[PDB]
Structure formats: C-alpha cells, structure tokens
Amino acid sequence: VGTFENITAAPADPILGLADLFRADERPGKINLGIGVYFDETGKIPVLTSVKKAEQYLLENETTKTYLGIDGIPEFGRCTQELLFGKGSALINDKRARTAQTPGGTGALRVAADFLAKNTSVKRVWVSNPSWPNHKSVFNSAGLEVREYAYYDAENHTLDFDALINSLNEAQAGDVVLFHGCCHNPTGIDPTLEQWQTLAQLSVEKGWLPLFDFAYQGFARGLEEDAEGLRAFAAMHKELIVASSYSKNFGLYNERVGACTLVAADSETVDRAFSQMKAAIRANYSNPPAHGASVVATILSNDALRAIWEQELTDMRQRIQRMRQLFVNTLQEKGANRDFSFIIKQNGMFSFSGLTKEQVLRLREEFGVYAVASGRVNVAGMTPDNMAPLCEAIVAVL
Amino acid sequence: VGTFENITAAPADPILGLADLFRADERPGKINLGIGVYFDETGKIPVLTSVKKAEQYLLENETTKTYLGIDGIPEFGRCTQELLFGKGSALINDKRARTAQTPGGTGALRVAADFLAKNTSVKRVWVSNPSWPNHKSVFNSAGLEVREYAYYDAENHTLDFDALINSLNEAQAGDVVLFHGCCHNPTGIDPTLEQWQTLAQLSVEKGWLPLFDFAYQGFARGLEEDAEGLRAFAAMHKELIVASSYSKNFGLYNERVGACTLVAADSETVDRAFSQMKAAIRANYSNPPAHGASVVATILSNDALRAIWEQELTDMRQRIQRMRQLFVNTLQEKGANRDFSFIIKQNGMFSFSGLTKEQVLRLREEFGVYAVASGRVNVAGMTPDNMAPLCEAIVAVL
Ligand SMILES: Cc1ncc(COP(=O)(O)O)c(C=O)c1O
Ligand SMILES: Cc1ncc(COP(=O)(O)O)c(C=O)c1O
C-alpha cells in the first residue's frame, strides 16, 4: 500500500494562487494587482540599472562559485546592520548583532522560527490581525503557536492603538511579538514614532521578545525614516530579532536575498546563540545563494553604484504615491460615491480597499481585474494606461 | 530573564568548520583536502566555461527578476527528470513524477523531510554508516528518527553487502531508506548493478520508501551509467523520492541548485502529493533562487553548451582518477608499507583513507594537511605540486 495514497491536496496559496489564475486568463485586458511586485509606467517588472551594472561586474570578475560560509557574505551582513541600525549604532560597536544571509525574507523568518523552537523556551508568537498570510504558515511549520492581536480599525481605516495594546496585554513574558517595520501588510498603516516608543517601553516592561518583519525599507518615507521604530526598540531592548528582505527595494524577487539578524545582551551571548542559528541553517539549505546577495553587497559597498540605487528606490516610492493620488481622483471621476481619501494615508505598495470577498471575486471573473481576496490591492500594479479600466470595474461592483 | 541566556553552544561543523581553521593557519604550504569542491591542476576552484557562457546569455536576455513559481523553472524540472530516469522513461510518459527546484541538494533533502513529516506516517529514516554527516541533521530537524545500517567493510575496503542486508532487517514497511545514487560519501564504494537489483527486489518486498541522494551524477562512470541504480529501483517501485544536486557536476556550489523529485503510482496521486510539497516550500523559503537553476537549464536545453559541459565533466572525472593513481604511486615511493591499492577502486572525489582521528589531527597540527576527522580525503584537492609534500606527511604519521 502506497505511502502517498491518502495525502490530502493542499489549498491554493491566496497570493501565489492568483498568479497562476492570472497566467491562464486569456482576455487581453487583464490587470494584475495581486502579488507584491513593482511595475513601471510601462507595465513591465524591470531590473534596476544598478542591479544590471552589478551583475555585469560580477560576470567579468567572478573566478569561483565555491561555497559561502553558513552565514553568507560578510560584507553583506555588515552592510545590512548599517541599514537597520545606523552608521554608528551602539549594537554594532558593542558587537551585539550577528547577521546571516538567508534566501529571502521568508527564509529569514523560517530560520528564526527553527532557531527559537529548537533552542529556547519560546512556544507562542503574536502576529497582527490582519497580516501577511504566510506568517502563520512559517511559524506553525516550525512548531510554534500563533496568536493574533488587534491592529486595524475597518470603520475608520486607521490603527486601533487602544485595541492593540489591550490585546497584547495577554502576551506573557518570553513570547515573540511580530512587528512590521514599515508599510504594514496589508493595511499600509504604520505606528507613529510616539506609538513605536509606547510599544518599546511596553515591550521591555512586559518582557516580550521583539521580532521585526522588514520587507519594505524605503517604501514609506526613506531608508532611515522607515527604521525609526526599529531603532527605538534597539536602544531599549537587550534581545531582538530582525528578518529583512531585499526582494522589493532591489527588485531581486527571484534571487531570494534576505537576512536574519540576532541581537543579544553582549557579544558572548549573541555569538553563543548564533552558533545554533548557523546549525539550524546547516540542516535546512546548508549555505545561502550567492548571486543575489553578491549584487546587493556590490551596490551598497560602492558609493557611485549606491547613489544610482538610492535614486531608483526613490523613483519607485514616488511613482506609487502618484498612482495613489491618481487612484483616488479617478474613482470619483468614474462615479464612485464612497470616500477613498484614506488610501492616500497608507504607506507601501498595497492598499486595503475595503472591497468584500464577493466584490473582489466579481472583479476577476467579470472584468479580469485580479486582487487578493482580502481586498488588498497592489498600487504599484496601477499605471496611467490601466487606471481608467481598473476604476470603471471597481465602480461597476460597488 | 534573557531568552538567549539558556542557549547551549553548538559544535563546529565537521566539514565546514574545517575551512575556518585552514583560513587561520599560517604555516607555509598548507594543503586543503576537506570540503568536497573540485580543484584544477593549478589548485583553484574554477568556473566552468559553459557556466560563464550561460551567465552571459542570461545577463543579455533577462528582462525581469519577478518571482518564480513555488516549484521553480519548468524546463529545469523537465531536464532533471530526463537525466535521472532516461530520455524516454515510462515514469515521464505516464506523468508519474513531479520535480521541484530547491536550494541545493540539502534543500531537496529538507523539503522532503518536512513533506514526509507533515503529510505521511513516516517516522523513521535509515541512513548508511558511514554517511554524509548532515544527512542525520536534516531529517532530525523535521522530527524524524534516524537509524543507521551497515555498509562499509573497513578490513577489505569493500561493500559489506552481507552486513548491509542483515542490518536492514528491522526496517519496517513505510520506513524510508536512503541510498547514495553513486559515489558513496565518504567510502566511495557503490553497489554493483547486480547488487542494486538485489536491493530493488528486497525494497519492494519489505515495503520501503526509497530515497536517493544524487550529489555526484557523472563523477563515477558517466551521466547514464551512474543512474543505473536509481533506474533499477524506478522500474519496480510505485513511489520513491530523489534529492539531486547540481552543485558539483556543474561547479555551481554557492548558487544552490538542486531538485527534489516525487514519484507516485499515477499522475493523480503525485499531483495531489506534490501540492503538499509546494506548501512545505512556501513555509520555508517561499520560492527558489533563479540564477543557479537558470544557468543549468540553459546549458542542458542547448546542444552547444551541453556538449561543452559534458566534456568539462569528463575532464573533471579524468583528472580525479589520475590523482588517485598518482596518490597511490607516490605513497609507495615515499616509503609507505601499508597497501593503498583500494584507493583506485573508489569512485568520486573522496577516498576513505582509513586513518584514525588521531592521525588526522596530527596531519593538521604537525604538517598543515587538512582532512575530515573521519579519514575522508578529497582527491580532487590533490595536485602534481602538493602530491609529494602530502604523501611525505602521511607516511610520517603512519
Ligand atoms: C511582510 C512581509 N514579510 C516577508 C515577505 C517575504 O519576502 P521575500 O519574497 O523576500 O521572501 C513579504 C513579501 O513577500 C512580506 O510582505
Ligand atoms: C551525499 C550528499 N548529499 C547532499 C549534499 C549536499 O550538496 P549541496 O547542498 O551543496 O547541493 C552533498 C554535499 O554537500 C552530498 O555529498
């Protein structure tokens, strides 16, 4: 009798599932606003010029593909800690942080979940409601329980800071509380610097272990501005974890470039702990892929090349703010009677449109407009050319 | 209290922790015979000509870095199944196999471990003794018990087929049994075609689930000849799993190019099971890195680059066999009384020298010769320039 005979088919991934549905739809006027990738005005998903130049350099100068260390390219780790904590942070001078290059932000999250479940007493992880759907899947797969805390006020399209704190009042010491560093997924609402500080002081008091999902650094306001909430926690805590991704701000989606950074009280504890993290990595993928991280390190290490990239990231952040403004205006022109001003106040690539599961489904089957079932819409998928058909289909469904 | 203060330090990797000590040693004339990478006569770890050719083609024709599917590049999986099973295998025509691109062979083993642990009643994995050390860590990370079965005859330097058969007597039906496709690591002794057939018949009678690990396809005799063992199993079994790697037969170590292939009774079953394998990938690294696998797919699907790659693989295999002969010859001329003729009969990059842990440590600290503590020596690291100092050191420690 076969071992695979009684396996149950898995449900479709709500995000990556739409990509295959979109790839099959034959209608020419399709619009893809599901998966979080950046489109330019042309509607293509380009490769950054800084990335093409780095790859050109690596092609002519690479002499070996020999294995990287378990934790990856050292310069990649040093440059990652500078972006997260600053040029002259105390965590760096005191040698309190160790970084491992991982295959994407998702890889950085699994590495952390494996490390925590196999080496600590942690067993419960708090994730915002709503949040990235894959957060639950990653932590559950590592054997950790996942609890939800309040976050979003649907009636006012704002952060419910009172419900959030009242919800986190149930998290005991030693628990992991997952925070979006910036551009919350899918709400696009981030705490203010004061709200961050309120959570930081509340975190050290109740004894939580902070863990920062940080996939959109530079898409809210700026590389440094988007890290204030994190750097407010880092100046107050003795321990914290940061899983970051370069897929978005470098357009290196399929190369899987990410980092998991440990912070401990001193250098002897972070190194001791980092040895078990390297062991959890060894038993997973052994060592990380070089090409994507090698590109990021090349860009950050070269001033002339970094300048090119910082501008390309700025152009991405602002093209989204243009489509965001244009989205709201065009809705009113096409006959929408609801108020969509709150979309202007949301950060990042997404926007919680407030559409229902039925309206979203109807947009796909009747108009070929593809969005996630939660009503999350990729603002970076909108262009001047597809804006009018996109808004006409939304109004027809309201 | 700190969440990390109670963590226990992990030991250095017996293979990767070795290259750290080698980098620190300052004795002039160090020799590295540890990690399993290929060196040329110069003593460097080169990039294959076909790989550079493919990387240039990709740099010119790549227009986007958008995410791959959970299971990776389609063409990569198609050409992977042809290499393993044959140009016109029945497994492929009957659509019984599904392949998933993974980060290296290690990633294929972890994806299978998570898949089996979360979706089947598999609770035990049988691995050879000796074996690649990381085998036990990968399956343990998923909560699977790992038993060992006999394999090597340390007296005759041969396969102890009688002990192998007897030690696998308590292997239940539905247990997993791990076989090295070819170039057994570290012994270098592979089953004969007659022995493969004997194991295939026994495996179907006992109800095992065979799991093949192919890290060195093409390094024993050839691409087709090295797959005879697998293809004997494939012709008789309804279900099996294959974790293959391109790190070494393509020289793409740090790009993490691997493949996990499911085989089931029929198309409907493998599809149902493969959907759960994609779910385990999504919860780990989301989707695989494109560059490495893209290089492999380009070469394999182009007769011009493929004929070049196949000749490069032959050149690597033929240099290793020449170093095997020179290694035994120089040991004789340098005064060794022990008979090392068995080195010739071993396939792959490694030769189980038969040295004790004490002799290996004495070679390292007294002569700067670095080999794994199990006595495993990388013949691919020997050169005409380091052969004599190397052999002098061994004779001194015998
Ligand atoms: C909040 C958040 N964390 C992690 C990820 C995963 O990033 P990556 O594609 O680098 O694995 C995403 C987006 O994919 C995300 O939105
Ligand atoms: C038997 C065996 N399996 C798997 C691997 C994993 O190789 P990689 O992770 O580099 O693809 C190796 C060597 O590393 C090996 O020798």
Author numbering:
A (entry chain B), B (entry chain A): -1 to 396
Quote the study's own text.
E. coli aspartate aminotransferase (AAT) is a pyridoxal phosphate (PLP)-dependent enzyme that catalyses the reversible transamination of l-aspartate with α-ketoglutarate, yielding oxaloacetate and l-glutamate. During its catalytic cycle, AAT undergoes hinge movement to switch between an open conformation, in the ligand-free form, and a closed conformation upon association with substrates or inhibitors. Using our approach, we enrich the less populated but catalytically active closed conformation in order to increase catalytic efficiency (kcat/KM) with the non-native substrate l-phenylalanine, leading to altered substrate selectivity. Steady-state kinetics reveal kcat/KM increases of up to 100-fold towards this aromatic amino acid, resulting in a selectivity switch of up to 1900-fold, and structural analyses by room-temperature X-ray crystallography and multitemperature nuclear magnetic resonance (NMR) spectroscopy confirm that the conformational landscape is remodeled to favor the target state.
For example, the VFIT mutant from the Closed Library contains Val, Phe, Ile, and Thr residues at positions 35, 37, 43, and 64, respectively. To obtain structures in the absence of maleate, we applied a rigorous crystal soaking method to serially dilute and extract the inhibitor from the crystallized enzymes. Overlay of AAT structures (Chain A) in the presence and absence of maleate show transition from open to closed states upon inhibitor binding for WT, VFCS, and AIFS, but not for HEX, VFIT, and VFIY, which already adopt the closed conformation in the absence of bound inhibitor. We next analyzed two mutants from the Closed library (VFIT and VFIY). 19F NMR spectra at 278 K for both mutants showed a narrow peak centered at approximately ‒60.2 ppm that is similar to that of WT. However, unlike HEX, at higher temperatures the alternate conformation with the WT-like peak becomes the favored state.
